[PDB]
Amino acid sequence: MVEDLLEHAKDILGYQRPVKVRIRPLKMSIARVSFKYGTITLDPAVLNLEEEEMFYILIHELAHLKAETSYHSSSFWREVEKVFPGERAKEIEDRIMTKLQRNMV
Ligand SMILES: [Zn+2]
Secondary structure (H helix, E strand, C coil): CHHHHHHHHHHHHCCCCCCEEEECCCCCCCEEEECCCCEEEECHHHHHCCHHHHHHHHHHHHHHHHHCCCCCCHHHHHHHCCCCCCCHHHHHHHHHHHHHCCCCC
């Protein structure tokens, strides 16, 4: 499930940290991290997305943690681009926004 996706994401990014995934209802987004505690919190709606969209969210959030930034910097996007090349991250973000009408951090 989500756990298996997360392991694949850590392997691709080369990020061996014991990041924990929590599912919690969120108001203002569908996903966010804790840098301090090494967690990714997902709104339950994420669990019903297509696999590539779920994987995007995990990669996006893991990229925040790895790049150690909340700002979507060039080094942030470099991590994302280990999976989603070129224009693909924005395409998948658009799909997720169409479906859920909510943003990830
Ligand atoms: Zn972000």
